[PDB]
Amino acid sequence: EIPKPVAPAPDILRCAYAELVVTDLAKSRNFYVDVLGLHVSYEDENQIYLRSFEEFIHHNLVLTKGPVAALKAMAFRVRTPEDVDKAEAYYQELGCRTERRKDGFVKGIGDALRVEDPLGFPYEFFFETTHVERLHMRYDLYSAGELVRLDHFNQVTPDVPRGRKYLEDLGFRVTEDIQDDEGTTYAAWMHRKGTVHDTALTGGNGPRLHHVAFSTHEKHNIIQICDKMGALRISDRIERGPGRHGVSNAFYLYILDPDNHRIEIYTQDYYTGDPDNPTITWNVHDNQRRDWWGNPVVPSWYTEASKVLDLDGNVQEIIERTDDSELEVTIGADGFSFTRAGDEDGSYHGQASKGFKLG
Amino acid sequence: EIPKPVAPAPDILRCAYAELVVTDLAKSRNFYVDVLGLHVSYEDENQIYLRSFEEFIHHNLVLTKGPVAALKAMAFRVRTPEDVDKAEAYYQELGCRTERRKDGFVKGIGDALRVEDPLGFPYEFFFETTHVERLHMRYDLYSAGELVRLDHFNQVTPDVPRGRKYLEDLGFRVTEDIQDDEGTTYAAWMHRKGTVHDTALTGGNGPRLHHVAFSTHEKHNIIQICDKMGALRISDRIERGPGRHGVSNAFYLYILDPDNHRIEIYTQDYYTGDPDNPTITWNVHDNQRRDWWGNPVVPSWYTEASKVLDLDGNVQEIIERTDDSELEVTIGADGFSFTRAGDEDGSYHGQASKGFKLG
Amino acid sequence: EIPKPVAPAPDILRCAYAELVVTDLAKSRNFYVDVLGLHVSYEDENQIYLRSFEEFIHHNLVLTKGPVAALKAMAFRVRTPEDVDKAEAYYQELGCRTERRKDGFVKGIGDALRVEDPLGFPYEFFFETTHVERLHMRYDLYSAGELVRLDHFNQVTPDVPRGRKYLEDLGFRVTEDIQDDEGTTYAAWMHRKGTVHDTALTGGNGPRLHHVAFSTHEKHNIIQICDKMGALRISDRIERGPGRHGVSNAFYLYILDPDNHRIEIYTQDYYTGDPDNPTITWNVHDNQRRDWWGNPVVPSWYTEASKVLDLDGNVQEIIERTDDSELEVTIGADGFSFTRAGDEDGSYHGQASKGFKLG
Amino acid sequence: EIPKPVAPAPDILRCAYAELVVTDLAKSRNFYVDVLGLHVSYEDENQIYLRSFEEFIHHNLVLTKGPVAALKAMAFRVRTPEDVDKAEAYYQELGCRTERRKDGFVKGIGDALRVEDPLGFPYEFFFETTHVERLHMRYDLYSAGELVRLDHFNQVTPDVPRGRKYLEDLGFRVTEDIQDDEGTTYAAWMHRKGTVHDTALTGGNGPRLHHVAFSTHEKHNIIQICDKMGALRISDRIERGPGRHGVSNAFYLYILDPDNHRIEIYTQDYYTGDPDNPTITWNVHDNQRRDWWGNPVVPSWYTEASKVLDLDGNVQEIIERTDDSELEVTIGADGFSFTRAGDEDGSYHGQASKGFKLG
Ligand SMILES: O=C(O)C(=O)/C=C\C(=C/O)[N+](=O)[O-]
Ligand SMILES: O=C1C=CC([N+](=O)[O-])=C[C@]1(O)OO
Ligand SMILES: O=C1C=CC([N+](=O)[O-])=C[C@]1(O)OO
Ligand SMILES: O=C1C=CC([N+](=O)[O-])=C[C@H]1O
Ligand SMILES: [Ca+2]
Ligand SMILES: [Fe+2]
Ligand SMILES: [Fe+2]
Ligand SMILES: [Fe+2]
Ligand SMILES: [Fe+2]
């Protein structure tokens, strides 16, 4: 569907920051800085610029006050200045709306391209950025739940193979995926920096942003987040987890900000930088693929995701998935999942694992 | 009401071991030894004797081959040889059936008393025991999921207040409980050794044994047990967890052995040895009381538990609870739970937390 | 030989708090509160009262402004009010000075007895204390190096067997000790609460206070204290560690406060509550006894310790040890230590392990 | 002084494996397999092939029986089969001895080029390697001390700047170095894979191999290695640590194999893949540069290192450093180090930190 341009792909380094529209800047500030302990690079009455403990670029998260909570841009750092020109020609050849600012769209970023990409997502490409104090040895500042890096984004899109091919052309390498025996793809993970992923597609009504993911050093740092959320009596904002993922093998947690933007806390996946890095495909009915301990996937995880904006700041039209639903085929009334393939013991039919059905 | 005897209670030091009857010895061995890493002190075609990493007494668990899987004895060590006589007098005055074996009921234990207690539970009291090599610095043997001590038992009984009074008289001090505003007690925790408990009472049809708990050093050790069960493709034997308890504050996991005896893995509760240790009462509707992160309590946790035997080796008849059911008042069709008292937001009506209903 | 009184010992529960005299109260506040994260129960111009994360009694540590930095009192909590009576009668029979104050010596303590004990140490015994908010679930307050309990004191005294027998009559049970093949005892560890110790004797010139130890939950919380002191550029106040102890098997770290009072951080020793708990004796020349990894023991650890005060607030006269010196016999010019008993390989003559002499 | 070739550099992915010659195969196997838990990919009477938990290529270490313990090859994987031709051309232009084997030098490596590089080190470049089962989710085989990846090499060489420029032409990017005000360089670290390093240069008599480094997931894994070595009564084989590095910010430990080959265990350094990644220069006298906590650097760490072999299997002649010795300027009789720059308090003159002097 999406052809490969003749123009060369920009050389993408890694996911770098997201810009999220939030409704109430103070309430968001409490969440990101007071609960989560992210580091303020800059803030005013309109925006809060936040970085992780080990980051030296200006920010990993920008929160912008607005009327409608949404993703405004997912940004990728490119290797050279010229790569911003290479990105522009690329998305031009594709027929996508693009916007170039030599001065950047946000503080702490220089020359940048924003695009409405083929999947309806607002991507940013940029090289130039304001270096700040790298806080990686500032143990006087370290919190028990310290967020040390931006790791990845996850995008909800109807047709996964279509998006996958397009990301592949752009230079992302696919590391794992979820399929069924009848040829349906439910999800795919792909990378540039040599971790399991820098972004990922999740099958579903799209464009929507599923989540943004930050890394911690150790599993006990993720346990601390949960513990702190209990003490602040906000455990209702813990959406799902903690657990160990099947796909990626990372220890994980999903939480929800004031505007229901989903944040993932993530640690200890594996190295993927070799070009013949072996791929891993999971069957959708495998009850260890998402939570390795067989714990049930929370139904909100499959249905809820953030709005995304176009370049005029307007919410993008959602298109409905027509391929089968992961929720439905695993935990819905006609779904099933298994612990050992072909074994009736430890399998679930028409309900989730651990004795639950959908609420 | 169980009367306080005139006879002095045995000075109980701690929970010491449990004797569990199992149907297939070889399968059971694979779980406790090969999966969980417990250390064999003795075995034959009929029994397996197992101790934790820091134990010096002969064993913490005895698996005994039998035709019906059940708790045969929950054993407590007492401070002196003389306390065994005390225990016999005490139980006789209560009108209970007792049996005394000067050379013990199981290997590695000397003079012992077993009783059918007023709650219908098979308790043992002993002092004499064969000292073995204490493995506390045998780091050459240390597993990534190493089980380091026996921590507690947990008992299902229909009338908690009644059992509580009897256990206080016996010298246990209640450290935490769960109650509602209408007079109902759903569970109680009680100790001798200065941790949160040596046993506890869980409201339900009983006598049934709810679980036996072992401790790890660190939270990562419990994570590894989950990870290993995932690798062995027996995640369906993970019943509930891992999580942070409210009551007790401990990190925890619950897993099911081949006869569905429930085992808890536990770490990092607090010191309770001062005689005026503050008692903590939780409301039964508080959705952070069992799992602090608010994850739903799996239904089987409330409905399933092991049979217990009398002194003749027959299963004790089960007496139904008539008091309110914790399951029903919190996660049942007319149930209710809350995150913040008096707040509707993050409350649950007629269902479980995180988007689930009972399957 | 200190005689055994006819009067019964008081029932001691555990070590409870220390009172340290400090010379600059602001400078000390910065260390114990800002660096270490101790929680303030009460403060004014003259005194700071601090508790650990899991404590429900008023405080574990009192910092008292004064002219000469010293130990003012090491306090042990007793099981009942009448144990303070037993304590007074006990020490009086011993011929020791006593002072009783019905309203206590520091805020938050009630009826209290302080004594100049047979070894020159200021011991306190009390029962009454003001209960405070137990912060054990206050994870919104939890530091990456959080101190969770008061664990023990360690005293320096010239004649270890003499002190040992006195502490034994007083109800403490020896757990581990250090001796040589010539009859000399160098150190002894003894307890009431069922951990390795509540106090301990280190041979040397005394009465002096070697240290006060606080516990953490996990090994990484001790690592963080080190990492924080690095980031505050006060690494010169890390005296020794971190490491794994041979004796006690605890993970450990020694640091120095503004007045050189030594503080230990400690986690994960083993259960000692059974009366036949197997005692362990190490040879003084075993290079794994103090640090299990063989790392050398810093000479200041052997030579430096705090002054103690008598009941009139004057520094106790120091009596010189004549028994052999641990320092000299192990790491001095004619000292010796071994890795494997009998083996010349991995032994050290006239120097420290790992390639070092003493400066 | 090493000129840049006109021939394009091979595209280097990462350090891949080391081949070490050992004198007693059986004893070396005990150390690497039974003590350290590395995984066998192939073994016979002459050689052991070992890999780390997360590796998919054939091996990360080859132990080769032979007369003199030494490094035989340090191998880097390249991007494409063609990069092997490029490396041959590159080194031929340098005037270095080369040897090309189309079916490789060791099992499970295909087309390979070995060389005697300008510093005298036997480098290998390959692309082709036999894929093996990636053990990253094999938690049934995970050890409490698990080694999860090969992270880096560290080479000892007399002229750090000379070596630095040659590695830079070869595509390695410098991340951190150690220098003094007089203009001497003592040490430099350089990468390809996006971590602090794939190889490093330590100033000293060379060519020697300083160490081979493996990563763990968490800091506790490294503490387990030290605990297990105390239990095996081989703590004398613990050379240095465990510690937090200043350079790299990684938690670390140095141990010694039966042939005195040094192994580093290492975790949690930071991301370096952006092309403008800030370089960090430390002053040689800063006592927090090597151990962040101020612990002394063991002198053997500076003086001892492994012989390396030329292409005929003969040991390479060692050239003496004429630049200043890091040992002598920091811990030698004329050296010094500081905690805070310019502050004499926490400074050390003519000795090491923590009250120690050179052995
Ligand atoms: O004595 C302590 O300090 C302690 O906590 C336990 C043991 C100890 C030294 O102090 N040790 O070196 O083994
Ligand atoms: O981070 C992730 C990796 C694995 C995964 N999953 O559920 O296994 C989902 C996930 O959230 O996708 O981005
Ligand atoms: O270990 C326990 C402590 C707390 C608890 N719970 O679910 O809170 C249950 C529990 O399992 O009872 O013994
Ligand atoms: O790997 C490292 C990192 C830093 C370092 N150092 O002494 O700081 C030495 C090495 O062996
Ligand atoms: Ca009610
Ligand atoms: Fe994710
Ligand atoms: Fe329990
Ligand atoms: Fe101590
Ligand atoms: Fe290194």
Side-chain angles (χ1 to χ4, degrees), chain D residues 238-260:
Chain D
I238 303 174
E239 185 195 35
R240 181 191 159 201
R244 167 81 61 183
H245 280 313
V247 188
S248 80
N249 191 44
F251 192 94
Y252 77 78
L253 170 74
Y254 299 96
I255 62 182
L256 303 168
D257 88 349
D259 283 297
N260 274 57

mmCIF file of all heavy atoms in Angstrom, chain D residues 238-260:
data_model
loop_
_atom_site.group_PDB
_atom_site.id
_atom_site.type_symbol
_atom_site.label_atom_id
_atom_site.label_comp_id
_atom_site.label_asym_id
_atom_site.label_seq_id
_atom_site.Cartn_x
_atom_site.Cartn_y
_atom_site.Cartn_z
ATOM 1 N N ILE D 238 39.259 -12.806 44.542
ATOM 2 C CA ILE D 238 38.617 -11.502 44.403
ATOM 3 C C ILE D 238 39.757 -10.459 44.407
ATOM 4 O O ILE D 238 40.450 -10.255 45.414
ATOM 5 C CB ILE D 238 37.525 -11.223 45.485
ATOM 6 C CG1 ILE D 238 36.440 -12.336 45.464
ATOM 7 C CG2 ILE D 238 36.910 -9.850 45.326
ATOM 8 C CD1 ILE D 238 35.363 -12.258 46.590
ATOM 9 N N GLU D 239 39.952 -9.788 43.290
ATOM 10 C CA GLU D 239 41.094 -8.875 43.235
ATOM 11 C C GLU D 239 40.773 -7.508 43.826
ATOM 12 O O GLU D 239 41.528 -6.967 44.629
ATOM 13 C CB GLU D 239 41.618 -8.738 41.802
ATOM 14 C CG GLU D 239 42.913 -7.864 41.752
ATOM 15 C CD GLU D 239 43.306 -7.385 40.339
ATOM 16 O OE1 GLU D 239 42.416 -7.093 39.520
ATOM 17 O OE2 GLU D 239 44.526 -7.270 40.057
ATOM 18 N N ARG D 240 39.628 -6.964 43.424
ATOM 19 C CA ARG D 240 39.263 -5.573 43.666
ATOM 20 C C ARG D 240 37.766 -5.402 43.532
ATOM 21 O O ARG D 240 37.148 -5.842 42.521
ATOM 22 C CB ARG D 240 39.970 -4.664 42.655
ATOM 23 C CG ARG D 240 39.651 -3.173 42.854
ATOM 24 C CD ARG D 240 40.148 -2.317 41.700
ATOM 25 N NE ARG D 240 39.388 -1.065 41.700
ATOM 26 C CZ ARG D 240 39.242 -0.254 40.647
ATOM 27 N NH1 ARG D 240 39.871 -0.479 39.513
ATOM 28 N NH2 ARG D 240 38.477 0.809 40.738
ATOM 29 N N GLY D 241 37.190 -4.777 44.550
ATOM 30 C CA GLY D 241 35.765 -4.530 44.588
ATOM 31 C C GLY D 241 35.016 -5.370 45.633
ATOM 32 O O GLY D 241 35.631 -5.978 46.522
ATOM 33 N N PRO D 242 33.685 -5.370 45.549
ATOM 34 C CA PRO D 242 32.909 -4.726 44.488
ATOM 35 C C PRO D 242 32.840 -3.204 44.723
ATOM 36 O O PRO D 242 33.033 -2.741 45.873
ATOM 37 C CB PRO D 242 31.530 -5.385 44.632
ATOM 38 C CG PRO D 242 31.423 -5.656 46.153
ATOM 39 C CD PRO D 242 32.834 -5.954 46.609
ATOM 40 N N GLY D 243 32.622 -2.437 43.651
ATOM 41 C CA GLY D 243 32.530 -0.949 43.757
ATOM 42 C C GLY D 243 31.580 -0.285 42.755
ATOM 43 O O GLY D 243 31.002 -0.955 41.901
ATOM 44 N N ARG D 244 31.404 1.031 42.902
ATOM 45 C CA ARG D 244 30.818 1.845 41.854
ATOM 46 C C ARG D 244 31.973 2.562 41.177
ATOM 47 O O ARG D 244 32.768 3.248 41.831
ATOM 48 C CB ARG D 244 29.839 2.863 42.422
ATOM 49 C CG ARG D 244 29.392 3.971 41.447
ATOM 50 C CD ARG D 244 28.308 3.478 40.527
ATOM 51 N NE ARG D 244 27.129 3.070 41.278
ATOM 52 C CZ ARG D 244 26.042 2.551 40.730
ATOM 53 N NH1 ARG D 244 25.983 2.335 39.423
ATOM 54 N NH2 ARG D 244 25.027 2.220 41.500
ATOM 55 N N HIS D 245 32.083 2.407 39.866
ATOM 56 C CA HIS D 245 33.053 3.211 39.130
ATOM 57 C C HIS D 245 32.647 4.685 39.035
ATOM 58 O O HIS D 245 31.450 5.009 38.975
ATOM 59 C CB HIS D 245 33.118 2.734 37.695
ATOM 60 C CG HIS D 245 33.947 1.523 37.492
ATOM 61 N ND1 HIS D 245 35.220 1.373 38.022
ATOM 62 C CD2 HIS D 245 33.661 0.373 36.841
ATOM 63 C CE1 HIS D 245 35.693 0.193 37.654
ATOM 64 N NE2 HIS D 245 34.765 -0.428 36.938
ATOM 65 N N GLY D 246 33.638 5.573 38.935
ATOM 66 C CA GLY D 246 33.396 6.979 38.574
ATOM 67 C C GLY D 246 33.223 7.102 37.047
ATOM 68 O O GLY D 246 32.109 7.292 36.552
ATOM 69 N N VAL D 247 34.320 6.938 36.319
ATOM 70 C CA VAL D 247 34.300 6.569 34.875
ATOM 71 C C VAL D 247 33.370 5.385 34.614
ATOM 72 O O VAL D 247 33.597 4.291 35.127
ATOM 73 C CB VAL D 247 35.712 6.156 34.315
ATOM 74 C CG1 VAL D 247 35.678 5.969 32.780
ATOM 75 C CG2 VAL D 247 36.845 7.163 34.728
ATOM 76 N N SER D 248 32.390 5.616 33.744
ATOM 77 C CA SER D 248 31.361 4.650 33.334
ATOM 78 C C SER D 248 30.135 4.651 34.212
ATOM 79 O O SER D 248 29.037 4.314 33.735
ATOM 80 C CB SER D 248 31.873 3.210 33.117
ATOM 81 O OG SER D 248 32.023 2.519 34.356
ATOM 82 N N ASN D 249 30.293 4.990 35.495
ATOM 83 C CA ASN D 249 29.165 4.931 36.427
ATOM 84 C C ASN D 249 28.674 3.473 36.663
ATOM 85 O O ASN D 249 27.652 3.268 37.301
ATOM 86 C CB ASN D 249 28.021 5.861 35.930
ATOM 87 C CG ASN D 249 26.906 6.089 36.940
ATOM 88 O OD1 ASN D 249 27.150 6.325 38.149
ATOM 89 N ND2 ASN D 249 25.645 6.055 36.443
ATOM 90 N N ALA D 250 29.426 2.470 36.226
ATOM 91 C CA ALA D 250 28.969 1.064 36.411
ATOM 92 C C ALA D 250 29.338 0.444 37.771
ATOM 93 O O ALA D 250 30.414 0.737 38.376
ATOM 94 C CB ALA D 250 29.469 0.215 35.342
ATOM 95 N N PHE D 251 28.453 -0.412 38.267
ATOM 96 C CA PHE D 251 28.789 -1.218 39.458
ATOM 97 C C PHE D 251 29.691 -2.331 38.974
ATOM 98 O O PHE D 251 29.519 -2.826 37.866
ATOM 99 C CB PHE D 251 27.490 -1.711 40.105
ATOM 100 C CG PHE D 251 27.655 -2.308 41.486
ATOM 101 C CD1 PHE D 251 27.475 -1.529 42.628
ATOM 102 C CD2 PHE D 251 27.887 -3.681 41.642
ATOM 103 C CE1 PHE D 251 27.584 -2.101 43.902
ATOM 104 C CE2 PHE D 251 27.986 -4.224 42.932
ATOM 105 C CZ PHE D 251 27.832 -3.421 44.047
ATOM 106 N N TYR D 252 30.702 -2.703 39.755
ATOM 107 C CA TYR D 252 31.765 -3.559 39.241
ATOM 108 C C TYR D 252 32.407 -4.489 40.282
ATOM 109 O O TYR D 252 32.238 -4.336 41.496
ATOM 110 C CB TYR D 252 32.892 -2.684 38.630
ATOM 111 C CG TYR D 252 33.794 -2.032 39.662
ATOM 112 C CD1 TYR D 252 34.814 -2.761 40.305
ATOM 113 C CD2 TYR D 252 33.634 -0.678 40.016
ATOM 114 C CE1 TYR D 252 35.659 -2.158 41.270
ATOM 115 C CE2 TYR D 252 34.484 -0.064 40.964
ATOM 116 C CZ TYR D 252 35.475 -0.822 41.595
ATOM 117 O OH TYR D 252 36.266 -0.231 42.539
ATOM 118 N N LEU D 253 33.173 -5.436 39.759
ATOM 119 C CA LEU D 253 34.000 -6.372 40.530
ATOM 120 C C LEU D 253 35.060 -6.973 39.608
ATOM 121 O O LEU D 253 34.737 -7.397 38.486
ATOM 122 C CB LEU D 253 33.103 -7.527 41.052
ATOM 123 C CG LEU D 253 33.833 -8.697 41.674
ATOM 124 C CD1 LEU D 253 34.359 -8.233 43.080
ATOM 125 C CD2 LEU D 253 32.876 -9.922 41.766
ATOM 126 N N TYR D 254 36.303 -7.027 40.094
ATOM 127 C CA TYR D 254 37.392 -7.745 39.413
ATOM 128 C C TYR D 254 37.760 -9.055 40.082
ATOM 129 O O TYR D 254 38.166 -9.056 41.239
ATOM 130 C CB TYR D 254 38.663 -6.878 39.296
ATOM 131 C CG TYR D 254 38.410 -5.630 38.503
ATOM 132 C CD1 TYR D 254 38.115 -4.449 39.161
ATOM 133 C CD2 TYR D 254 38.392 -5.631 37.109
ATOM 134 C CE1 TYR D 254 37.838 -3.303 38.468
ATOM 135 C CE2 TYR D 254 38.144 -4.458 36.403
ATOM 136 C CZ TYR D 254 37.869 -3.315 37.090
ATOM 137 O OH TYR D 254 37.590 -2.124 36.460
ATOM 138 N N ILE D 255 37.671 -10.155 39.341
ATOM 139 C CA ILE D 255 38.148 -11.449 39.862
ATOM 140 C C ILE D 255 39.206 -12.102 38.943
ATOM 141 O O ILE D 255 39.393 -11.659 37.785
ATOM 142 C CB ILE D 255 37.005 -12.414 40.062
ATOM 143 C CG1 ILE D 255 36.350 -12.674 38.683
ATOM 144 C CG2 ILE D 255 36.048 -11.801 41.107
ATOM 145 C CD1 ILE D 255 35.122 -13.608 38.690
ATOM 146 N N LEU D 256 39.870 -13.137 39.456
ATOM 147 C CA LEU D 256 41.027 -13.751 38.781
ATOM 148 C C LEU D 256 40.785 -15.205 38.525
ATOM 149 O O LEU D 256 40.402 -15.935 39.452
ATOM 150 C CB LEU D 256 42.301 -13.598 39.633
ATOM 151 C CG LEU D 256 42.707 -12.148 40.014
ATOM 152 C CD1 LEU D 256 43.803 -12.176 41.107
ATOM 153 C CD2 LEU D 256 43.218 -11.335 38.799
ATOM 154 N N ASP D 257 40.959 -15.630 37.267
ATOM 155 C CA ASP D 257 40.788 -17.052 36.922
ATOM 156 C C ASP D 257 42.035 -17.874 37.363
ATOM 157 O O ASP D 257 43.006 -17.296 37.889
ATOM 158 C CB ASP D 257 40.337 -17.211 35.445
ATOM 159 C CG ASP D 257 41.488 -17.299 34.434
ATOM 160 O OD1 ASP D 257 42.676 -17.045 34.767
ATOM 161 O OD2 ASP D 257 41.175 -17.645 33.264
ATOM 162 N N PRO D 258 42.037 -19.207 37.152
ATOM 163 C CA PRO D 258 43.183 -20.013 37.613
ATOM 164 C C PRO D 258 44.527 -19.616 36.988
ATOM 165 O O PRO D 258 45.564 -19.878 37.589
ATOM 166 C CB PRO D 258 42.798 -21.421 37.161
ATOM 167 C CG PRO D 258 41.297 -21.416 37.259
ATOM 168 C CD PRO D 258 40.980 -20.082 36.609
ATOM 169 N N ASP D 259 44.496 -19.013 35.806
ATOM 170 C CA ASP D 259 45.707 -18.574 35.111
ATOM 171 C C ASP D 259 46.013 -17.090 35.324
ATOM 172 O O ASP D 259 46.877 -16.510 34.616
ATOM 173 C CB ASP D 259 45.571 -18.909 33.604
ATOM 174 C CG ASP D 259 45.806 -20.392 33.329
ATOM 175 O OD1 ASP D 259 46.947 -20.866 33.599
ATOM 176 O OD2 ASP D 259 44.883 -21.104 32.857
ATOM 177 N N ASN D 260 45.308 -16.474 36.283
ATOM 178 C CA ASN D 260 45.409 -15.031 36.588
ATOM 179 C C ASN D 260 44.920 -14.074 35.514
ATOM 180 O O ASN D 260 45.262 -12.885 35.558
ATOM 181 C CB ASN D 260 46.838 -14.652 36.948
ATOM 182 C CG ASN D 260 47.111 -14.860 38.368
ATOM 183 O OD1 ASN D 260 46.951 -15.967 38.886
ATOM 184 N ND2 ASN D 260 47.478 -13.782 39.057
#
